[PDB]
Amino acid sequence: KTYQCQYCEYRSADSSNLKTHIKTKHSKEK
C-alpha cells in the first residue's frame, strides 16, 4: 500500500503526500 513518483524516486504512504511531493519538487514551482 505504497505509491511512487514517476519523475524521480520518492515514495509515499498516503497518496496526498506523494501529490504534494511532485507539486513542490517537479510540477513547475519556478
Contact footprint for Zn ion (CB under 5 A): 5, 7-8, 10, 25
Distances (CA, A) of 6 to 1, 9, 21: 17, 7, 11
CB of 18 to Zn ion, least distance (A): 8
Instruction: Report residue 24 as a C-alpha cell.
Output: 513542490
CB of 28 to Zn ion, least distance (A): 13
Q: What stretch of H or E contains 3?
A: strand 3-4
CB of 1 to Zn ion, least distance (A): 19
